[PDB]
Design a protein around this ligand. Structure first.
Ligand SMILES: CC(=O)O[C@@]12CO[C@@H]1C[C@H](O)[C@@]1(C)C(=O)[C@H](O)C3=C(C)[C@@H](OC(=O)[C@H](O)[C@@H](NC(=O)c4ccccc4)c4ccccc4)C[C@@](O)([C@@H](OC(=O)c4ccccc4)[C@H]21)C3(C)C
Ligand SMILES: CC(=O)O[C@@]12CO[C@@H]1C[C@H](O)[C@@]1(C)C(=O)[C@H](O)C3=C(C)[C@@H](OC(=O)[C@H](O)[C@@H](NC(=O)c4ccccc4)c4ccccc4)C[C@@](O)([C@@H](OC(=O)c4ccccc4)[C@H]21)C3(C)C
Ligand SMILES: *[C@@H]1O[C@H](CO)[C@@H](O[C@@H]2O[C@H](CO)[C@@H](O)[C@H](O)[C@H]2NC(C)=O)[C@H](O)[C@H]1NC(C)=O
Ligand SMILES: *[C@@H]1O[C@H](CO)[C@@H](O[C@@H]2O[C@H](CO)[C@@H](O)[C@H](O)[C@H]2NC(C)=O)[C@H](O)[C@H]1NC(C)=O
Ligand SMILES: *[C@@H]1O[C@H](CO)[C@@H](O[C@@H]2O[C@H](CO)[C@@H](O)[C@H](O)[C@H]2NC(C)=O)[C@H](O)[C@H]1NC(C)=O
Ligand SMILES: *[C@@H]1O[C@H](CO)[C@@H](O[C@@H]2O[C@H](CO)[C@@H](O)[C@H](O)[C@H]2NC(C)=O)[C@H](O)[C@H]1NC(C)=O
Ligand SMILES: *[C@@H]1O[C@H](CO)[C@@H](O[C@@H]2O[C@H](CO)[C@@H](O)[C@H](O)[C@H]2NC(C)=O)[C@H](O)[C@H]1NC(C)=O
Ligand SMILES: *[C@@H]1O[C@H](CO)[C@@H](O[C@@H]2O[C@H](CO)[C@@H](O)[C@H](O)[C@H]2NC(C)=O)[C@H](O)[C@H]1NC(C)=O
Ligand SMILES: CC(=O)N[C@H]1[C@H](O[C@@H]2[C@H](O)[C@@H](O)O[C@H](CO)[C@H]2O)O[C@H](CO)[C@@H](O)[C@@H]1O
Ligand SMILES: CC(=O)N[C@H]1[C@H](O[C@@H]2[C@H](O)[C@@H](O)O[C@H](CO)[C@H]2O)O[C@H](CO)[C@@H](O)[C@@H]1O
Ligand SMILES: CC(=O)N[C@@H]1[C@@H](O)[C@H](O)[C@@H](CO)O[C@H]1O
Ligand SMILES: CC(=O)N[C@@H]1[C@@H](O)[C@H](O)[C@@H](CO)O[C@H]1O
Ligand SMILES: CC(=O)N[C@@H]1[C@@H](O)[C@H](O)[C@@H](CO)O[C@H]1O
Ligand SMILES: CC(=O)N[C@@H]1[C@@H](O)[C@H](O)[C@@H](CO)O[C@H]1O
Ligand SMILES: *[C@@H]1O[C@H](CO)[C@@H](O)[C@H](O)[C@H]1NC(C)=O
Ligand SMILES: *[C@@H]1O[C@H](CO)[C@@H](O)[C@H](O)[C@H]1NC(C)=O
Ligand SMILES: *[C@@H]1O[C@H](CO)[C@@H](O)[C@H](O)[C@H]1NC(C)=O
Ligand SMILES: *[C@@H]1O[C@H](CO)[C@@H](O)[C@H](O)[C@H]1NC(C)=O
Ligand SMILES: OC[C@H]1O[C@@H](O)[C@H](O)[C@H]1O
Ligand SMILES: OC[C@H]1O[C@@H](O)[C@H](O)[C@H]1O
Lengths: 756, 756
C-alpha cells in the first residue's frame, strides 16, 4: 500500500544531497551493499567503506549520555536528569558538550538522543531514564534541543527508537547464538497502536527530532501491529518518510532487522551491526543484498536511495572536509573483539561545571518540613552505600554498567545500566561533598556505607550513630537497565532497611534518591521523622558537589518532576508491561493518548507527587494571565520541514507557525531568592480528550524576594490541533480551549478561555 | 630495705607543695582515703573529692593521642608518627595541642604520654605505637617535649608505664569479674631486669619525663623480679622516688594494684579506678584503707604524703584559681555506666593544619626507584580498603577503636586500638586526596576498596583496571591493639593478596603502609614492579592530605624510621614475647641494653631498613665534623631535678650539664630542595657496650639545591656515662669514644675520637 519515497535533501541538506547523489551514482552494487550493512570495528556499529570513491568507514557509537566505552571523557547526567531541570539552555548545552566529546573521540554518528521511544507508558520501563519527560510536548522540545546540540558539533544523530518502543520485557532482539534463535522462542512484543494515539502521542517528539535535523533514525525492536518496526511500511515509508518527510537514514537497532527483502522494501537503510558482534544478531544484507539486487528481487534504485540517505549526513556536517580523528577505543570488548585501545583525553574545561550545574538545576525537592536549607549542623550522619564509591571502582560494572554482581555495593547511582551508560573519570561522591562542607563548619560527620542487612555490626553502628546527630542524610538508589523492566517500585539494595533504621533512631532524616525512575517511599514519606525528600535522578560524575550546595542553601532547589509519582503501581495505565510465554505477545494500547499524568487526571487518581511538581525554598504567586492573539509568527528557524497535512494549509503556512503567545507574571512571595519553572497547559475540546495537555514551560532564574517577572509561552498551530483519523490531517477543533498556568500539572491558579 | 621518702616539692613545685601540705594537714582519715582511691564518674579515673576543704573530683582521662572517648576533638597522630618526624618542634606542638583539648574538655590529669614503657624490646608489641622511638635517648627527648607540651597547657601528666612493661601477652591486669579472678589463673609476666639495663635502657626516658615535670607516673601491669610494679619498693621508693627524686604521685594502672598494705608501703599513691568499672579491677583502698590506718597497720603519715603528692600538681598548674570546665562525656560506656553525654567542640583553628604537618613530616620513604615524585599521571589506580572510610563509620569500632569485627573493613588506619586511641571528627581518606589531585590534572582515578579475597568480582576488577594505569597506589595496613601482641609481622586484612595482584597486573606500584609497627613485605620489597614504598604510620585525621603533597613532590619526604625494620622476626632480640600457661610467667631480659638496632649491630645482622633510615627526593653530603670541647653549659632549664648519683659530682654540677657540643655540615647535593634529619651516635668504651648509641638528632628544613647548613649536637654528661653497678652511680668511663654523624644508624660518613 505504501511505496518508498525518494530522498530530495529537504530544506538545509539540499547541497549535501547533491554531493551524496553524485557519489552514489558512481557506486557499484558490491559497494552499495557495503555502505549499507555493518562491518567489524571498534565502534558500536561501523558501515563498510567505499574505498575507491574515498569514503571511509563510519563509526556509529553509543549513546545518549555521551560516547560509551571510552576513556578520556566525561559522564554527563542522563536525559531524565536534564528534563528535570526544565531549562532549555541546559538541554542544549548538555547535548553540545556531548557532541564535542563524540566528535573528538572520532564518532561520525551518535546513537542518540532518545527522542520519544520509550516515551513513558510504564513507570517500570528499565531504560525509561534514557529519554526525558513522560509527555509528548516536553519530550518534543528536549528532543529538538538534544539533536540540535549534537549536530552543531560535528556529529550526525541517530534519534531513537522509532516507535512505540514502550517495554523492555519481550523486546526480543533478533539473535541466533549457539543454536538457539529468538525467532524460535518468541516474537517481539507487538505494540498495537491506533492512528490518533500514534500521531498525537508517539510521533510528536520524532517530528521535533526531524524538524531539528536528525540525520538518521533508529527503528525499534518492538513490532507494531504484528509487523517488525524495521520492516513496517506504514511506519517507515508512510509515517516517517512521507508524512514527517524524513530525508535521512533509518538504521536498524542491533538485532532490529528480522528479514532481507521486506526491510529492503519497507524503509530500512542500514543493517546494523552486520558482521560485528560475531553476526549473532542477524546478518541479512551484505553479500546477500548484492545477490538480491543482481537476481532482480530487490530494486537497485531503491538501494541507491539508502546510500543517498547515509551520505547526506556525511556531507551536510562536513565530515569530508573536516574528518573526525581516528576512533581509538575497543568499545565491543574481548573475546567478541580482541583489539587494543589507545588513549585520548577529550575532557574540555567547562564540561565538569556544566555537568554540575545540570545536577544543581535538576535535583527536585519533594518534601521539606523545615529542615532545609541546612544552616551549620555540627553532628552529621550519613547512611547508604549510594553515598560513596562503588566498592569495585566507578567503572567496574563494565562497558555498559551492568556486569557487577546482583548484590554488589555499586555506590552513587550516576547513570543507569545498558547501552545508554558511559564510563566516568571519577565520582564526586555525596559523602566527599558533605564532608568538605562539614569541615568548613568545624563539624563532625560519619557515614555507614556498608550493607545494613548483611554486614556484621552495621545495624548496631547505625543505632549508636543516629541518636546524637543533628541531621541524618539517607542516600537511596534504584538501578535499572536496558533489557528488563523493573518488577515493582521497590528501592534497590538495602534501601527499605536503611529507612526503617533511620526513622527508628533519628527525627531529622533527609532523604536523597538517585534513581532511573519512580520508587516506593510509601512506608516513610508521611513519617514526620522524614523531614525532607529530594530526587537527584542520575547526575553523572558530579553527584556530590551538585547536591550539597542545594542542601546548604547556596541555591534553592529548582527542578520539577518529569513524570508522575503515583502512590502505587496500580494507579498507572494498566498492562504497562505484558508478560507472556505466548509466541506472538501483544500490547494493545487501549489507554490511547492517556499515559502518565493524562491517565491520572482522566480517572481522578491523586499521585503522591504530580507531573511538574517541585518545591523551592521560597514561594511564587501567579498573576495577570494575558492571551495575545496578535503575537503570531512564521515558521523560520527549523533545519528541516515535515509534510504533515493540516486543514488550514495554503501556499505559505505551517503547522509550526506561532498563532498566539501567552504571558503571565510570577512574584517571589517568600523570604529567599529562587528560580521557578512555570508551566502552561491547554485543554483542547473534543470527544475523549485529556483534561490537560502541557504546551509550554519557562524557567525564571534567581528571582529576588518581592520581585516579579513575566513568563512567556508561544503557542503553535500544532499545539492546538487534533488528528482527524477520517480526514488524515491535523486540524484545529472548534470549541472552547482552556489555557492554564502555574507551578505544576495540579497547581494552576490562572486560567482563561480561547476560541478560534 | 627501702623506706618511702617524703615529698618536698623539688625545684618548680616548691610553692605548690606548701599549699598541698597545708590542705593535707587539715584532712581527716576518711578524707585521705577519698582523694587517694578512684570513684565513679565520666572520666577514665576519678579521685574522690574533699568537699569540706573545697577540693573537687579530679578527672583522670585517656590518652596519649588526646582525650579519648569525646566528641568535639581532633584525632592527633600517634607517638610513633611524631617520633618519625625527628622534629622537636612538632613533638612539642603536638603535645601542646593535645593539652589544649584535654584542658578544654575538663581533664585535670592526662593519662599520657607514654614515656618509655613499652620502649621497644619486641617489634610485635601490640601497643608499641603509643610511644615514640625504640631508643632510650630519642624516646627520652620526645618524652621531655610531650610532657612539657601537656603541662604548659593546664593539664597534669601521668607518664606511663613504669617500668619494663615490654609485652602485652600475660600482662594480666588484676580483674575479678563473674567469679573468675586473674589471681587464680596467672600472675603477670615478671620482667627480670639487671641493674645496668634498668638504668641505661628503661629508666632513661622516665628521668627525662621527671626532669620535664611530670606531675604523676603510672605504675605498670607487669611484675619486676616477681614483684608487682605497683608494689615494688626498689622500683617506686628507691629508683623513682629516691634516685630520680620524683616529687609527684604514682598512679596505678587500671588493675595495676594487687594488694592493700604492700602498695601502701612500697610507693603507690593513687588506687585507680577504685569504685569505677564496677570495682571489677580490684578495690583495695577506700574504706579498707581507712580501716588499715585506724587499726594502725598503715602509717597515717605515709598516706598524708600520698595526698600531698596528688595535690602538688593540682596547685602547681593553677587548677584552683583557674579550674577546668566540667567534663561532659560518658567515656566509660553503658551498661558499665549509664549516664548521658553533653556536647562541646574544642577544635581550635590551627590544630588540623598541625596534624597534617606532622603527617607530612613523618611519612617515610623506604624505596624509590624513580616513580616519585609523581609528575601528572593521567590514569591512576588505587587498591585497598585502607584507601577509604571504615565502611561502618570512622568511630564505629567504639570508645577504644577495638570492637569492630575481626574481618571488618576499617578503612585508613589512623590510630591503633585500645586506651591510646581517640574518636575522629572525620577522616581525610587517601582516596579523597588522590582524587582532588587527579581532578586538578584533568586525570582519571578509580579505586578497588573491597576485600579482594572475599567479595565477588574484586579480583577481576583489579585485573581489568591495573594494566591501563600509569600508576597503581596500593594502601596497606596493620591494626594492633592493647592487650595482645601481634603474632607475626604479616599484613592485616587482604594485604598480601592485594600485593600479589598488584605486581601481577602493574609495573608501577607505589606502596603505602598505615601501621602500628614493622610488617612483612619480604615477598614484594625487591620486586621491580614495586617502584616505591612509604610508611605513613598512624597519621590521625588528616591521613590523605598529609600524604598526597609528598607523593606529588610539593614537599620531599623527610621522615626516618624510629625503629629497626628487620627482614624476619628471628633477626630480633629472642624471647621478645613469652607465651606460657605457667602460673608465674617469666621474661629474663638477658639481651641487656641490646634492644632494636643495638641487637642488630652487636650481632652483625642486616635489617631491610635500619634505625633512622629515610629517603628524600634529593641527596645530602656530610662534611667538616667539629668537636667543640669549649662549648659547655650549666643545667638551667629543667622544671625538676633528679638525684642520680654520679662520680664527678661536687657542690654545683649536674649529670645533665652540656660538657661539649658537636657540629657538622650537610650540603644538598642533588637536584631538589629537601629537609634532612642528621643523627649523631657515640660508642662509649667498656665491656659489653653497644657498637653505637644515638646521642643527637637535628632536622635541617627545606635546604635548597647546593646550599649548606650546620647541624649542632650538644652532649650532656649523662650522654657519655655508664652506670657502675658496684659503685651505684653514673660515671664517665676512661677510654676512646667514637663519635659518628650521618643520615642513619648505618650511613655515618663522618667520625672522630674524643677522650676525657
Ligand atoms: C543481545 C544484545 O543486545 O547484544 C548487544 C551486542 O549488540 C547488542 C546491542 C546492545 O546495546 C549491546 C551492545 C549492549 O550494550 C547491551 O547493554 C548489552 C546487553 C543487553 C547484553 O544482551 C543480553 O543481556 C541478552 O539478553 C542476552 N541474550 C541471550 O543470552 C540469548 C541468547 C539466545 C537466545 C535468546 C537470548 C545476551 C547476553 C550475552 C550475549 C548475547 C546476548 C549483551 C551485551 O554484552 C551486548 O552484547 C554483546 O556484546 C554480544 C552479543 C552477541 C555476541 C557477542 C557479544 C549488547 C551488553 C553490553 C551487556
Ligand atoms: C580489663 C581492662 O583493661 O578493663 C578496662 C576498664 O578499665 C580498664 C582500663 C582499660 O584501658 C580499658 C578502659 C580499655 O580502654 C581497654 O582498651 C579495653 C580492654 C583492653 C578490654 O579488656 C579486655 O579486653 C580484657 O582482656 C577482658 N578480660 C576478660 O574477659 C577476663 C575476665 C576474667 C578473668 C580474666 C580476663 C575483658 C573484656 C571485657 C570486660 C572486662 C575484661 C575492656 C575495655 O572495655 C575496658 O574495660 C571496661 O570498660 C570494663 C571492665 C570491667 C568491667 C566493666 C567494664 C578497659 C576496653 C575499652 C575494650
Ligand atoms: C567494504 O568495506 C570494507 C571495510 O570497511 C573495506 O575494507 C577496508 O578498507 C580500508 C580502506 O577503506 C582498509 O584500510 C582496510 O584494510 C579494509 N578492511 C578490511 C577488514 O578488509 C572494503 O574495501 C570495502 N569494499 C569496497 C568494495 O569498497
Ligand atoms: C495499526 O493499526 C491501527 C488500527 O487499525 C491503524 O489505524 C488505522 O489507520 C488508518 C490509516 O492508516 C485509518 O483510516 C483507520 O481509521 C485507523 N484506525 C484506528 C482504529 O486508528 C494504524 O495506522 C496501524 N499502524 C501501523 C503502523 O500499521
Ligand atoms: C549493581 O549493579 C549490578 C549491575 O552492574 C546490578 O546487578 C543486576 O541487577 C539486575 C536487577 O536489576 C539483575 O536482573 C541482573 O542479573 C544483575 N546483573 C548481574 C550481572 O548479576 C545490581 O543489582 C546493582 N547493585 C545494587 C545493590 O542494586
Ligand atoms: C568523697 O568523694 C565523693 C565523690 O567525689 C564525694 O561526694 C560527692 O561530693 C560532691 C561535692 O564534692 C557532690 O556534689 C556529689 O553529690 C557527691 N557524689 C556522690 C556520689 O555522693 C564525697 O563528699 C567525698 N567524701 C568526703 C568525706 O569528702
Ligand atoms: C632485680 O634483680 C636484679 C638482679 O638481681 C637487681 O640487680 C642488682 O641490684 C643491686 C642494687 O639494687 C646491685 O648491687 C646488684 O649487683 C644488681 N645485680 C645485677 C645482676 O644487676 C635489680 O636491682 C632488681 N631490680 C628490682 C627493681 O628489684
Ligand atoms: C578492624 O578492627 C577490629 C577491631 O575494632 C579488628 O578486630 C580485632 O582483631 C584482633 C587481632 O588484632 C583480634 O584479636 C580481636 O578479637 C578483633 N576484635 C573483635 C571485636 O573481633 C580487625 O582485625 C580490624 N580489621 C582488619 C581488616 O584488620
Ligand atoms: C477521529 C477518530 O478518531 N475517529 C474514530 C476512529 O475509527 C475509525 C474511523 O471511524 C473511520 O476511518 O472508519 C474506521 C472503520 O469502521 C474506524 O475504525 O478511531 C477510533 C478507534 O480507536 C474510533 O473510536 C474513533 O471514533
Ligand atoms: C659493672 C657491672 O655491671 N658489674 C657486674 C654485675 O654483677 C654484680 C656485681 O659484680 C657486684 O655488685 O656483685 C654481684 C654479686 O656477686 C654481681 O652479681 O652485673 C652483671 C650481671 O648482669 C655482671 O656480669 C657485671 O660484670
Ligand atoms: C542469498 C541469495 O542468493 N538469495 C537469493 C536471491 O539471490 C535470488 C532468489 C531466487 O530468485 O533466491 C534468494 O534466496
Ligand atoms: C489520504 C490517505 O493517505 N488515506 C486515506 C484515503 O484512502 C482516502 O481516500 C482519504 C479521503 O481523503 O481518507 C484516508 O482514509
Ligand atoms: C578491711 C579491714 O578492716 N582490714 C583489717 C585491718 O583494719 C586490721 C587488721 C587486723 O589488725 O586486719 C585487716 O584485715
Ligand atoms: C649505696 C647504695 O645505695 N647501695 C649499696 C650499698 O649497700 C653499699 O654500701 C655501696 C658501697 O658504696 O654499694 C651498693 O652496692
Ligand atoms: C579472541 O580471542 C579469544 C582467545 O583469548 C578467542 O576465543 C576468540 O576466538 C577471539 N575472537 C574472535 C572474534 O576471533
Ligand atoms: C522518630 O524518631 C524517634 C527517635 O528520635 C523515635 O523514638 C520515634 O519512634 C520515631 N517516630 C516515628 C514516627 O518513626
Ligand atoms: C545500666 O543499665 C542497665 C540496663 O539497661 C543495667 O543492666 C545496669 O545495672 C546499669 N548499670 C549500673 C552500673 O548500674
Ligand atoms: C610485573 O608486571 C607485569 C605486568 O605489567 C607482569 O607481566 C610481570 O610478570 C611482573 N613482574 C614481576 C616481577 O612481578
Ligand atoms: O545504541 C543503542 C541501541 O543500539 C545498540 O547499541 C542497541 O541495539 C540499542 O540498545
Ligand atoms: O590510661 C591507659 C592506662 O590506664 C587505663 O585506662 C589502663 O589501665 C591503661 O591501659
Amino acid at each position: 500500500q505504501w511505496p518508498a519515497p525518494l530522498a530530495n535533501g529537504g530544506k538545509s541538506w539540499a547541497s549535501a544531497f547533491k554531493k551524496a547523489k553524485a557519489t552514489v551514482t558512481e557506486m557499484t552494487v558490491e559497494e552499495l551493499a557495503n555502505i549499507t550493512s555493518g562491518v567489524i570495528g571498534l565502534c558500536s556499529g561501523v558501515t563498510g567503506a567505499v574505498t575507491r570513491l574515498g569514503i571511509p568507514e563510519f563509526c556509529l557509537q553509543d549513546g545518549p549520555i555521551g560516547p560509551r566505552g571510552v576513556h578520556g571523557s566525561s559522564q554527563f547526567p542522563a536525559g531524565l536528569t536534564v528534563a528535570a531541570t526544565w531549562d532549555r539552555t541546559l538541554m542544549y548545552a548538555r547535548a553540545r558538550g556531548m557532541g564535542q566529546e563524540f566528535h573528538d573521540q572520532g564518532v561520525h554518528l551518535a546513537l542518540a538522543p532518545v527522542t520519544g521511544g520509550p516515551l513513558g507508558r510504564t513507570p517500570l520501563n528499565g531504560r525509561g531514564w534514557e529519554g526525558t519527560f513522560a509527555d509528548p510536548y516536553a519530550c518534543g522540545e528536549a528532543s529538538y534541543l538534544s539533536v540540535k546540540g549534537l549536530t552543531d558539533a560535528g556529529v550526525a544523530t541517530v534519534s531513537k527508537h522509532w516507535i512505540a518502543y514502550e517495554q523492555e520485557t519481550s523486546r526480543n532482539l533478533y539473535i541466533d547464538i549457539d543454536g538457539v534463535s529468538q525467532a524460535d522462542i518468541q516474537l517481539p512484543i507487538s505494540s498495537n497502536v491506533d492512528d490518533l494515539t500514534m500521531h498525537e502521542l508517539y510521533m510528536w517528539s520524532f517530528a521535533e527530532a526531524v524538524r531539528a535535523g536528525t540525520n538518521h533514525i533508529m527503528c525499534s525492536y518492538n513490532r507494531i501491529n504484528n509487523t517488525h518496526s524495521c520492516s513496517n511500511a506504514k511506519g517507515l515509508n508512510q509515517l516517517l518518510k512521507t508524512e514527517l518527510n524524513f530525508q535521512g537514514g533509518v538504521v536498524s537497532d542491533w538485532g532490529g532487522q528480522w528479514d532481507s527483502v521486506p526491510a529492503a522494501e519497507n524503509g530500512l537503510d542500514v543493517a546494523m551491526p552486520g558482521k560485528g558482534f560475531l553476526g549473532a544478531l542477524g546478518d541479512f544484507w551484505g553479500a546477500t543484498l548484492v545477490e538480491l539486487i543482481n537476481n532482480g528481487t530487490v530494486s537497485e534504485d531503491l538501494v541507491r536511495d539508502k546510500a543517498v540517505r547515509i551520505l547526506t549526513g556525511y556531507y551536510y556536517l562536513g565530515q569530508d572536509t573536516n574528518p573526525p580523528p581516528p576512533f581509538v577505543y575497543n568499545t565491543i570488548g574481548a573475546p567478541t573483539l580482541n583489539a587494543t585501545s589507545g588513549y585520548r583525553n577529550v575532557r574540555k574545561p567547562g564540561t565538569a561545571e556544566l555537568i554540575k550545574e545540570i545536577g544543581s538545576a535538576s535535583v527536585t525537592l519533594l518534601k521539606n518540613t523545615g529542615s532545609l536549607p541546612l544552616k551549620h549542623p555540627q553532628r552529621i550522619a550519613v547512611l547508604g552505600n549510594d553515598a560513596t564509591y562503588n566498592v569495585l571502582g566507578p567503572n567496574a560494572c563494565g562497558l555498559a554498567n551492568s556486569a557487577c554482581d546482583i548484590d554488589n555495593l555499586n555506590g552513587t547511582l550516576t547513570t543507569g545500566g545498558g547501552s545508554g551508560s558511559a564510563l566516568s573519570p571519577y565520582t564526586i561522591t555525596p559523602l566527599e561533598a558533605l564532608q568538605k562542607r562539614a569541615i568548613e563548619d568545624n563539624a563532625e560527620i560519619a557515614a555507614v556505607v556498608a550493607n545494613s542487612n548483611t554486614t556484621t555490626g552495621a545495624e548496631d553502628a547505625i543505632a549508636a550513630l543516629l541518636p546524637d546527630a543533628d541531621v541524618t542524610f539517607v542516600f537511596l538508589n534504584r538501578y535499572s537497565e536496558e533489557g528488563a523492566d523493573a518488577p515493582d517500585f521497590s528501592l534497590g539494595g538495602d534501601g527499605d532497611n536503611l529507612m526503617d533504621l533511620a526513622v527508628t533512631y533519628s527525627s531529622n532524616v533527609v532523604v536523597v534518591i538517585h534513581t532511573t525512575g519512580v520508587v516506593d517511599i510509601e512506608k516513610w514519606a508521611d513519617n514526620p521523622n522524614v523531614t525532607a525528600i529530594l530526587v537527584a535522578y542520575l547526575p553523572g560524575q558530579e553527584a556530590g558537589n551538585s547536591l550539597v550546595p542545594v542542601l546548604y542553601g547556596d541555591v534553592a532547589p529548582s527542578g520539577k518532576l518529569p513524570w508522575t509519582w503515583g502512590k502505587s503501581i496500580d494507579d498507572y495505565v494498566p498492562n504497562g508491561v505484558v508478560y507472556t510465554d505466548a509466541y506472538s505477545p501483544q500490547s494493545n494500547f487501549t489507554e490511547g493518548v492517556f499515559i502518565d499524568y493524562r491517565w491520572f487526571d482522566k480517572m481522578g487518581i491523586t499521585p503522591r507527587y504530580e507531573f511538574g511538581f517541585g518545591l523551592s525554598y521560597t514561594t511564587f504567586t501567579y498573576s495577570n494571565l494575558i492571551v495575545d492573539h496578535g503575537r503570531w509568527a512564521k515558521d523560520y528557524s527549523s533545519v528541516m520541514e515535515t509534510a504533515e497535512p493540516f486543514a488550514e494549509w495554503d501556499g505559505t503556512n505551517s503547522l509550526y507557525d506561532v498563532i498566539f503567545t501567552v504571558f503571565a507574571t510570577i512574584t517571589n512571595t517568600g523570604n529567599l531568592t529562587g528560580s521557578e519553572v512555570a508551566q502552561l497547559y491547554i485543554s483542547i475540546p473534543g470527544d475523549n480528550q485529556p483534561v490537560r495537555q502541557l504546551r509550554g514551560f519557562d524557567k525564571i532564574k534567581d528571582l529576588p524576594v518581592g520581585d516579579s517577572a513575566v513568563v512567556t509561552f508561544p503557542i503553535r498551530r500544532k499545539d492546538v490541533s487534533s488528528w482527524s483519523v477520517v480526514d488524515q490531517l491535523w486540524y484545529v477543533p472548534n470549541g472552547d480551549f482552556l489555557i492554564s498556568v502555574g507551578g505544576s500539572s495540579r497547581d494552576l491558579p490562572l486560567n482563561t478561555t480561547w476560541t478560534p
